[PDB]
């Protein structure tokens, strides 16, 4: 299981 999340402001 590969879980990924990213935020760019």
Cα 4 to the center of its chain, rounded Å: 4
How far, in Å, CA of 4 to CA of 9, rounded? Answer: 17
Structural resolution in Å:
0.9
The coordinates were experimentally obtained by electron diffraction
How far, in Å, CA of 5 to CA of 9, rounded? Answer: 14
How far, in Å, CA of 6 to CA of 4, rounded? Answer: 7
Secondary structure (DSSP) of 1-9? ---------
4: how many CB neighbours lie within 10 A of its CB? 4
How far, in Å, CA of 1 to CA of 9, rounded? Answer: 27
């Amino acid at each position: 299981e590969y879980n990924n999340q990213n935020n760019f402001v």
